[PDB]
Amino acid sequence: MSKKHTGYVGLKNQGATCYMNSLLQTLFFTNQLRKAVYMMPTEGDDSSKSVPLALQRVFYELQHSDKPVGTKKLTKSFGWETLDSFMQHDVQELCRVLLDNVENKMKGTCVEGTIPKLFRGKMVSYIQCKEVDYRSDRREDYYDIQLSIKGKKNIFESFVDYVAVEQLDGDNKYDAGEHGLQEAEKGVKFLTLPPVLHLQLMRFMYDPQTDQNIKINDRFEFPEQLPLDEFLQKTDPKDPANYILHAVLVHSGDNHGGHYVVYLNPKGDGKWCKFDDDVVSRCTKEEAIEHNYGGHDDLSVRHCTNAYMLVYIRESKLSEVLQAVTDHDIPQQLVERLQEEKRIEAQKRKERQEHH
Ligand SMILES: C[C@H](CC(=O)N1CCC(O)(Cn2cnc3c(Br)csc3c2=O)CC1)c1ccccc1
Structure with missing residues (x-):
């Protein structure tokens, strides 16, 4: 079979x-x-x-x-x-x-x-006061990354957003302790990226007006080859952060009673199979990748088949x-x-x- x-x-x-x-x-x-x-x-x-x-x-x-x-x-x-x-x-x-x-x-x-x-992998999260000499650095291990999808077209834009500097000013100044409230910058930096990179896409977001989590079916594109050097604080000339798509975990529907499948090219050779519980079948690269981008926001259909998690492996x-x-x-x-x-x-x- x-x-x-x-x-x-x-x-x-x-x-x-x-x-x-x-x-x-x-x-x-x-x-x-x-x-x-x-x-x-x-x-x-x-x-x-x-x-x-x-x-x-x-x-x-x-x-x-x-x-x-x-x-x-x-x-x-x-x-x-x-x-x-x-x-x-x-x-x-x-x-x-x-x-x-x-x-x-x-x-x-x-x-x-x-x-x-x-x-x-290793990252550092920071809060730097602007006007006074104070900085808090929290070094953290991670085994996965949760990427923001809403209003982002692709993985590149999510990573850009991930390392974006947040200004803590006006009504949300930083409590700098004995320096009182202080204008500050907050962000996260990547020190290292692991050999096997697990990326979850943040499609199941809380909705105030329905008081529930709702799945966002918007278009989000991810490449076969993912260069991440620019998101590293310090790059490595002999080991650039070039990643190859290994797996695309996909969901169809609006709830946990939907259909879950996974696309993989197990050998990292771009030859993909669809894993649908008991049925494993060969599929095109396009079925694995672009057809799980979602969006298509087309009236007759509700398109709600798309990727929620990606696995990349460092080249x-x-x-x-x-x-x-x-x-x-x-x-x-x-x-x-x-x-x-x-x-x-x-x-x-x-x-x-x-x-x-
Ligand atoms: C309804 C169904 C529920 C589900 O199986 N999943 C819950 C969400 C899931 O964990 C992906 N994911 C992971 N971390 C987050 C965070 Br943190 C905020 S939203 C978020 C998210 O979305 C994948 C499993 C679903 C499937 C795919 C996308 C959206 C909803």
């Missing part, structure tokens, strides 16, 4: 997990992550409690299964077992849960630090982030534990039908 068409298998549609399946594929094809994950020492773990073991299972099955892969034990493991869990959280929050879990499980192993190595890191994964990257002990796991579930299904 879809494994035979594309080389890639899908994930089952099992309840309403919204953006989850999209995110799981995204992470699975972050090959360096997937390798580290197989290396976690989950020997002792409980399969319905351990996010690390449950993820190993999902990735292993994605790598070896010919049929669509289930996620029930994974959702049970991090406790998001209803629509409501998914409705209470942004996509990046789920991603943070998965990454934190596996990062913690890599402590004291041969693969410790993989998660910050791949996903962590200089691409061959290493998307380093290939072979049978040798899956420890035998893990393979045995996962077969043991498939047998125990094959027995729980037989015991469940007998009682009914």
Whole structure:
């Protein structure tokens, strides 16, 4: 079926997990992550409690299964077992849960630090007083960036807006402590950009006049090749911040009952597939990229299919982030534990039908 068409298998549609399946594929094809994950020492773990073991299972099955892969034990493991869990959280929050879990499980192993190595960048947020000599600098790690979309035509304009200087004057002067209220400038600077760049687009904005979040379907364009050197405080001549589009997570509709899919070119070679739960299919570059720009603001239709998250990988890191994964990257002990796991579930299904 879809494994035979594309080389890639899908994930089952099992309840309403919204953006989850999209995110799981995204992470699975972050090959360096997937390798580290197989290396976690989950020997002792409980399969319905351990996010690390449950993820190993999902990735292993994605790598070896010919049929669509289930996620029930994974959702049970991090406790998001209803629509409501998914409705209470942004996509990046789920991603943070998965990454934190596996990062913690890599402590004291041969693969410790993989998660910050791949996903962590450095920024500094500042408030500079204009008339007095005072500055507050807050250095922060980030694993993702939330880009403003409203009134922005493209990623370049969002980044421009992201690093824009805000004037704190008049009615909103800065409380400068013992200097009293002071005229000031506020901004954020990027010190580094991580090898794997996760960008969420801010389409689900609070609306005062309906007192709810509403999805903004406006046009927002993102390129295949993304140069970010100009947003770095200090550029690097031997490692320019040139990024290549890896994944486009897409939503259709106006609510969490809409359709979620993800487009990926897993090898970073511009050859794209559409991942729609159990159906993986080849698609054009144009289907993956421009057709998810949205807008088209055309009267007969409501056009509400568009990108909400993008994954870019730094050109200089691409061959290493998307380093290939072979049978040798899956420890035998893990393979045995996962077969043991498939047998125990094959027995729980037989015991469940007998009682009914
Ligand atoms: C209705 C549906 C809900 C949903 O699944 N998502 C909630 C929003 C989502 O987290 C993207 N996203 C992430 N951080 C933010 C922030 Br912070 C402000 S708005 C914002 C946003 O929009 C993706 C998952 C949706 C889908 C796509 C775009 C807009 C709405």
